[PDB]
Design an enzyme around this catalytic site. Structure first.
Site, mmCIF file in Angstrom:
data_model
loop_
_atom_site.group_PDB
_atom_site.id
_atom_site.type_symbol
_atom_site.label_atom_id
_atom_site.label_comp_id
_atom_site.label_asym_id
_atom_site.label_seq_id
_atom_site.Cartn_x
_atom_site.Cartn_y
_atom_site.Cartn_z
ATOM 1 C CG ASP A 180 -2.131 0.882 0.955
ATOM 2 O OD1 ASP A 180 -2.439 1.321 -0.266
ATOM 3 O OD2 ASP A 180 -2.950 0.846 2.004
ATOM 4 C CB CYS A 214 -5.700 -1.457 -4.244
ATOM 5 S SG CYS A 214 -5.930 0.101 -4.752
ATOM 6 N NE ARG A 220 -2.312 -0.984 -2.616
ATOM 7 C CZ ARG A 220 -2.489 -2.042 -1.840
ATOM 8 N NH1 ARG A 220 -1.964 -3.139 -1.506
ATOM 9 N NH2 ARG A 220 -3.389 -1.765 -0.593
ATOM 10 C CB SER A 221 -6.855 0.189 -8.447
ATOM 11 O OG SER A 221 -7.092 -0.702 -7.515
ATOM 12 C CD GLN A 261 -4.070 8.739 -3.293
ATOM 13 O OE1 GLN A 261 -3.552 8.990 -2.401
ATOM 14 N NE2 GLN A 261 -4.638 9.317 -4.333
HETATM 15 O O1 LIG Z 1 -2.334 2.328 -2.726
HETATM 16 C C1 LIG Z 1 -3.318 2.234 -2.913
HETATM 17 O O2 LIG Z 1 -3.755 1.576 -3.853
HETATM 18 C C2 LIG Z 1 -4.729 2.880 -1.979
HETATM 19 O O3 LIG Z 1 -3.899 3.747 -1.116
HETATM 20 C C3 LIG Z 1 -4.668 3.537 0.443
HETATM 21 C C4 LIG Z 1 -5.608 4.981 0.498
HETATM 22 C C5 LIG Z 1 -5.204 6.199 -0.066
HETATM 23 C C6 LIG Z 1 -6.037 7.578 -0.003
HETATM 24 C C7 LIG Z 1 -6.997 7.171 0.961
HETATM 25 C C8 LIG Z 1 -7.669 6.143 1.439
HETATM 26 C C9 LIG Z 1 -6.761 4.927 1.250
#
Ligand SMILES: O=C(O)COCc1ccccc1
Length: 297
Positions: A180, A214, A220-221, A261
Site C-alpha cells: 500500500d 486495492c 495500485r488500481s 496516490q
Molecule cells: O495504494 C493504494 O492503492 C490505495 O491507497 C490507500 C488509500 C489512499 C487514500 C485514501 C484512503 C486509502
C-alpha cells in the site's frame, strides 16, 4: 518520447513536482450520492468517493450505491470498474455489481492484511467445500480451483444467481506482493501479471468491464489501468512517442479521483510502460524473460 522524459525527470529528481502538477490539473466533479448519510457505512474511506457522473449503480430499489467508478477509455476501447476493497457489509453488493456488469475477471492488488490492519474483507471462499451465500443479494459463490505462483494467485470461482439459477465462471487475479502506497518488486512481475490478465480474455470487449481494486481503488488500481491503457494505445499506434502518460492519467482522473496516490507510483507507471513497450514493438521473447525475472515458480 517517454524514455527521455523519464531520464530528464529522474536525473533532475522532479517526480514530486510532475506529480503535484497532475494533482493541480485533475478534474473535480460532484460526489453527492457518496456523501449521503445513509451511504456513510458503504465507504471504506471518507476522502475517496466516486463522482456521480461515472459511479456504478446497483440494480436494487432500496439503495443503488457502491463505491465504484466506470473508467471508459474511448480511444483504447477499454473500460474498467475501479472499486474499494469490500467492507464486511458490502461483500454482497460487490458480487451483485460483478453479476449486473457481466464482468469476467476481478483483479485484486492488495493483501487482506497490510501493515497489521485489515485492508479488505475476505470476500471469496478459501476452500472448495465451503461456499459463500450472500443472503442480502441472493448470490452463491464457490471456489472451483486455485493456482498459486510466488507473488500472485489465480482462482476460478463460480457465481450463481440463486433467484434465476444462472451460473458464471469468474476469474480472480490476486497480485500478492504489492505494498500500500508502494510499487512492485521490479516492473517485471507486474507486467507478467498484467499479460496473464489480458491472456484470460477478462479485458476483452465481449465481456463487461474488469473489476479492479486495492484498499481504496485509486493507487495500485490506478497503476494497473494506466499501464494497460498506455500499452494498448502504443499497440494501436505502433508509436511509443505518441503516448503521453500524463495526459492518459488526467483523462482517467475525469472518471475517478486520486488515481496514482504517490510520485513513486507515477515513476513506476512510466517504468512499467517503458519496459512493456519492448513487447508492443515486436520483441515477443521479452515476455519469457519477465516470467524468469518474476520468479513465479
Ligand atoms: O495504494 C493504494 O492503492 C490505495 O491507497 C490507500 C488509500 C489512499 C487514500 C485514501 C484512503 C486509502
Amino acid at each position: 518520447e517517454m524514455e527521455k522524459e523519464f531520464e530528464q525527470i529522474d536525473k533532475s529528481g522532479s517526480w514530486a513536482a510532475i506529480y503535484q502538477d497532475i494533482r493541480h490539473e485533475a478534474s473535480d466533479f460532484p460526489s453527492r450520492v457518496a456523501k449521503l448519510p445513509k451511504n456513510k457505512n458503504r465507504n471504506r474511506y471518507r476522502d475517496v468517493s466516486p463522482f456521480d457522473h461515472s459511479r456504478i449503480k446497483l440494480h436494487q430499489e432500496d439503495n443503488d450505491y457502491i463505491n465504484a467508478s466506470l473508467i471508459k477509455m474511448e480511444e483504447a476501447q477499454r473500460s474498467y470498474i475501479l472499486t474499494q476493497g469490500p467492507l464486511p457489509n458490502t461483500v454482497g453488493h460487490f458480487w451483485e455489481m460483478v453479476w449486473e456488469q457481466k464482468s469476467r475477471g476481478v483483479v485484486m492488488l492488495n493483501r487482506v492484511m497490510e501493515k497489521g490492519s485489515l485492508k479488505c474483507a475476505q470476500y471469496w471462499p478459501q476452500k472448495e467445500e465451503k461456499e459463500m451465500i450472500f443472503e442480502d443479494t441472493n448470490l452463491k459463490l464457490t471456489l472451483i480451483s486455485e493456482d498459486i505462483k510466488s507473488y500472485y494467485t489465480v482462482r476460478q470461482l463460480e457465481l450463481e444467481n440463486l433467484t434465476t439459477q444462472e451460473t458464471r465462471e469468474i476469474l480472480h487475479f490476486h497480485y500478492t506482493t504489492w505494498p500500500d502506497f508502494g510499487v512492485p518488486e521490479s516492473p517485471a512481475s507486474f507486467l507478467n501479471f498484467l499479460f496473464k490478465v489480458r491472456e484470460s480474455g477478462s479485458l476483452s470487449p465481449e465481456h463487461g468491464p474488469v473489476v479492479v481494486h486495492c484498499s481504496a481503488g485509486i493507487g495500485r488500481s490506478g497503476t494497473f489501468c494506466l499501464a494497460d491503457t498506455c500499452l494498448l494505445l502504443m499497440d494501436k499506434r505502433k508509436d511509443p512517442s505518441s503516448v503521453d502518460i500524463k495526459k492518459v492519467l488526467l483523462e482517467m482522473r475525469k472518471f475517478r479521483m486520486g488515481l496514482i496516490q504517490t510520485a513513486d507510483q507515477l515513476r513506476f507507471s512510466y517504468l512499467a510502460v517503458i519496459e512493456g513497450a519492448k513487447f508492443i514493438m515486436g520483441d515477443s521473447s521479452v515476455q519469457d524473460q519477465w516470467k524468469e525475472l518474476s520468479h513465479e515458480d
